[PDB]
Write a protein that binds this ligand. Structure first.
Ligand SMILES: CC(C)CCC[C@@H](C)[C@H]1CC[C@H]2[C@@H]3CC=C4C[C@@H](OC(=O)CCC(=O)O)CC[C@]4(C)[C@H]3CC[C@]12C
Ligand SMILES: C[N+](C)(C)CC#CCOC1=NOCC1
Length: 285
């Protein structure tokens, strides 16, 4: 606890955090193992879901746990060359999950507008570059900047007892990294799913009850759990100390909720994944 006085009441945030970390690990592992044990699920369509679960597994295991030690124990206790690894891994994995959703939305979009054209040409070797580009671009957007910022301009500038990205102070690279990570994917995903909805209602018109419910549930989950951090980070650059520390931490923690919810909005939609989850959970095999 260190600085966390009155420990009898601060265990609530520790207990809740542990539950949410367990759900993310349990939920995302189920996606991975269901893919392996179910033959019908081993299609090129589910490769993106497997890639999405891999990024969320890293967030649930390392990002959601090492951040908890930073909260209850109100200072970093790992060293300079131990938090740059955490920041690089957490930010790359968080970017990978969002980039995986962007690839998933594109794959879904072309499967609705081109039912007889897209999935035939998009083969296993074509989904590799789709998955590969999501991780490679997520790799070189934060990690070279996070790791080598202290080694490139001046020296280390963050206080020794704390830890953060250390280039968020300048309101130039933070805008470039924010739009390339959140604002651009949000615009594309919203446009693509609105386009998807316009064709689901068109199909039933020629021949919306579940399209409106499902599409609004998946977009709001991404919007709610990612917007507060991307709004406070931009304000933090222009402002100096008007963002409370407690409010900043909640938005930082709210991003990890997307990893918990992702297996529900993308895997549980498929009836084959839903059956396999109950098979493993109830009758352990
Ligand atoms: C950092 C981000 C905000 C800027 C760069 C965005 C790109 C990384 C994303 C957005 C649009 C995505 C593309 C949308 C459409 C396609 C076409 C798609 O190919 C097809 O749909 C044709 C059928 C086939 O797959 O063979 C391959 C993935 C790709 C290049 C996607 C790759 C990843 C892209 C370029
Ligand atoms: C700070 N946290 C790692 C929890 C969130 C993050 C990140 C990486 O960048 C992105 N922000 O919006 C989408 C991806």
């Amino acid at each position: 606890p260190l600085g966390g006085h009155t420990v009898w009441q601060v265990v609530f945030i520790a207990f809740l955090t542990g539950i949410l970390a367990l759900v993310t690990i349990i939920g995302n592992i189920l996606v991975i193992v269901s893919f392996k044990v179910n033959k019908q699920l081993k299609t090129v369509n589910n490769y993106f879901l497997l890639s999405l679960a891999c990024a969320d597994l890293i967030i649930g295991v390392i990002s959601m746990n090492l951040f908890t030690t930073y909260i209850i124990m109100n200072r970093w206790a790992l060293g300079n060359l131990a938090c740059d690894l955490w920041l690089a891994i957490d930010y790359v994995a968080s970017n990978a999950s969002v980039m995986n959703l962007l690839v998933i939305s594109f794959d879904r979009y072309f499967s609705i507008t081109r039912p007889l054209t897209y999935r035939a040409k998009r083969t296993t070797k074509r989904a590799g570059v789709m998955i590969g580009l999501a991780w490679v671009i997520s790799f070189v957007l934060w990690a070279p900047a996070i790791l080598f910022w202290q080694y490139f301009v001046g020296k280390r500038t963050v206080p020794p007892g704390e830890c953060f990205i250390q280039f968020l102070s300048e309101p130039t690279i933070t805008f470039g990294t924010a739009i390339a990570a959140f604002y651009m994917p949000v615009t594309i995903m919203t446009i693509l799913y609105w386009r998807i909805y316009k064709e689901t209602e068109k199909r039933t018109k020629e021949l919306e009850k579940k399209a409106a419910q499902t599409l609004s549930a998946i977009l709001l989950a991404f919007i709610i759990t990612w917007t507060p951090y991307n709004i406070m980070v931009l304000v933090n650059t222009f402002c100096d100390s008007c963002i409370p520390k407690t409010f900043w931490n909640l938005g930082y923690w709210l991003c990890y909720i997307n990893s918990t919810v992702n297996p529900v909005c993308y895997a549980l939609c498929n009836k084959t994944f839903r059956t396999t989850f109950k098979m493993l959970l109830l009758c352990q095999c």
